Symmetry: C2
Subunit: 431 residues, 2 copies
């Protein structure tokens, strides 16, 4: 499996961080293809703990080439920040990173817009991440936006910037009645990093085609969870962009038929940060237990943290949307100690009918009741275990049912944070 | 391939209509996955000539189910017009067409807005086809739009429509200084058809996955040319939609690993409507010859198509973006009677640089001169030939040269309009 795609299969927070780092060991190119500066790859770099949201984690390895495809909305300020920070620790970023000329630019007015659309709602706020991502994609399809390739013609850029800023400033001062954004400041700020940005521009789609013909190992990294997909998720409690492995081709330029293996990161139980359907949410002591054990008090990304059992109906949808090839199971150890474990196998609709596939977004998720398949828990601690024999038969049967209920094999089991605390049953790259 | 994707490989006007129609003889499901009511499929229904812009041509066959994927922006008005006309001619549309709940709605204000923008730039475009498509994509990415799924809950729809119309009218009148669109009208107009629409809604993703594992033949039809793709085409001379096969997974919900064969319609020479880079354009007797022989007259926003030699550098980009399986060659006969034929195999840059891959969009496309390979033309007529024996050796040599320069086989040769004037060297559904 030369071209591998790695993405969370639920609503984010599955634990894609450790796994990504792991595959970086054999991958020669690491490619971001969707979203923006919201990757959330927390890591310990040169002693201290830091977070990379835009630049891939592969920037840390010697002979790995990190790429930001056109699908990513590019914020120069965010890029500049992470660059500086990494250069500080002695990482030669400028020589290990490449950009697509087609990446859309997120500039000051975009953050302003997001921030105004959040506070304009007020009571009925959405819990927008307000990073300017949405407004950048908006200008792109509207075709008044700017991309990295515009920085090659500095005059034209200045002219294009004025027209877009006139339009957005108008909306800002008059409609949202917020502050205006100074054109010259935005112009000077960008013109300052222009040369740096253009120097990392490469024909990414041809590069990836050449890597394909040579059989180079390429990994595509997805930023957010599947069910948060703008088209196919739990609309409207969804995200500002596509999140499924279906965005790989459009977002990178690689042909659709060349995706070899798609790895779904699957957490042993479910969590959702924020509002939205969650048929399997618990409001009792087990919920509390899981929340506590999972040490997910809002540990990385959020204004909420709802716990609940694994939902195979929803995972089955992720399987289908992403044509998953295999799963990597994370956080199994959170279930260590339970007397009885459960997995939702179907939903009972508000009108009495039972379903094995997620209902339409327009259907009544507010009245779905999950049907659970109850099964034996285990007491032996499975944390840090690195062999099958180290997993109590109850846990093995749990793993076994998941594969039977989804039709996708569990090729890797992450039993802890260290690289050595992993069980690779198949390896995406050799498959 | 069980799952086939058919699309134009150049700048449009490649002539896919006849091929799409031929393929629907075998396909069990026909799927639209991108664009809006701009398909321009000219055909002959129940004895009369018609044009279908939104409903797939597959609606004409009893064994076929036509599906309009989420990737398509749907105008309810356009839909109603096409359905009625079809029903009139005796084609029971309502029982053969399905829709996704996630198709964005194009409403009266999207059209007004699209128009306002044209007015604001220049009056010299009889905006009639595809109006509103762009603004609809905008609202969707901004998460403030309406989807078919929203028509289930009437109360909610009304408040949602009220909020977005409030926003757009502010633009219309204050910014564009144009007229506002009436709420009550749109709300009512949209209510008259609401149940007609939601009754055709289905779980498209599940359906396609079911067809996939059952092994039914599914054909996806793309509606524009590859090089006009919003991310990958000749920016800024591109459409607002993605036009490459990578849009299939996202616009229909089919898993990415499930695209089997990608058929690219290739015209034997090139045409381009409007403005933008066209390195192989002709300004001579030959140019006018290809236009007159090819009947390349006005039908694209009031204009004659610009003509030129087949450009294999530009075609190799398409092969790569779409991961093409094979070509369907059209209009070879337009070259009948020329004394020599040329194929462009490389580009000479203004800086004397000679490249065989298309340069970035941010490159000096005006200083590009094409490097041609000339070869003997042929005097024999190749129109309607149905077997390779009826074709002259000089033609077989041209055909052969294209496959050599591109790397992809020419699997179908359409030599005329009748379904019999076709040489199927491979059949996409077997391969």
């Amino acid at each position: 499996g030369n071209n591998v795609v790695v993405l969370g299969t639920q609503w984010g927070d599955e634990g894609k961080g450790k796994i990504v780092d792991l595959l970086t060991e054999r991958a020669k190119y690491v490619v971001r293809y969707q979203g923006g500066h919201n990757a959330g790859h927390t890591l310990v770099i040169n002693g201290e703990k830091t977070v990379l949201h835009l630049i891939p984690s592969g920037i840390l390895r010697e002979n790995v080439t990190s790429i930001i495809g056109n699908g990513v909305v590019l914020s120069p300020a965010a890029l500049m920040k992470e660059m500086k920070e990494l250069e500080d620790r002695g990482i030669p970023v400028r020589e290990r990173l490449l950009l697509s000329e087609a990446c859309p630019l997120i500039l000051d007015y975009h953050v302003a817009l997001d921030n105004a659309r959040e506070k304009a709602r007020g009571a009925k706020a959405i819990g927008t991440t307000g990073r300017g991502i949405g407004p950048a994609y908006e200008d792109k399809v509207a075709r008044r936006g700017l991309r990295v390739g515009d920085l090659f013609d500095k005059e034209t850029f200045a002219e294009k910037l004025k027209e877009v800023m006139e339009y957005h400033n108008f909306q800002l001062v008059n409609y949202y009645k917020a502050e205006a954004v100074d054109y010259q400041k935005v112009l000077d700020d960008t013109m300052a990093v222009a040369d740096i940005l253009t120097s990392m521009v490469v024909d990414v789609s041809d590069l990836l085609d050449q890597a394909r013909q040579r059989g180079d190992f390429v990994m595509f990294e997805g930023a957010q969870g599947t069910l948060l997909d703008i088209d196919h998720g739990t609309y409207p409690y969804v995200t500002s962009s596509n999140t499924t492995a279906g965005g790989v081709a459009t977002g990178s330029g690689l042909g659709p038929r060349y995706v070899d293996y798609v790895l779904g990161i699957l957490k042993a139980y479910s969590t959702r940060v924020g509002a939205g359907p969650f048929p399997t949410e618990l409001f009792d002591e087990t919920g509390e237990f899981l929340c506590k054990q999972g040490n997910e008090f809002g540990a990385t990304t959020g204004r909420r943290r709802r716990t609940g059992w694994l939902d195979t109906v929803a995972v089955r949808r992720a399987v289908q949307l992403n044509s998953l090839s295999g799963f990597c199971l994370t956080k199994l150890d959170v279930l260590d100690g339970l007397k009885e474990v459960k997995l939702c196998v179907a939903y009972r609709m508000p009108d009495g009918r039972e379903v094995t596939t997620t209902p339409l977004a327009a259907d009544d998720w507010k009245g779905v009741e999950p049907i659970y398949e109850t099964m034996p828990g285990w007491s032996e601690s499975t944390f840090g275990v690195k062999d099958r024999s180290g997993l109590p038969q109850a846990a093995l049967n749990y793993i076994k049912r998941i594969e039977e209920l989804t039709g996708v094999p569990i090729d890797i089991i992450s039993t802890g944070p260290d690289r050595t605390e992993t069980m690779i049953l198949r390896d995406p790259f050799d498959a």
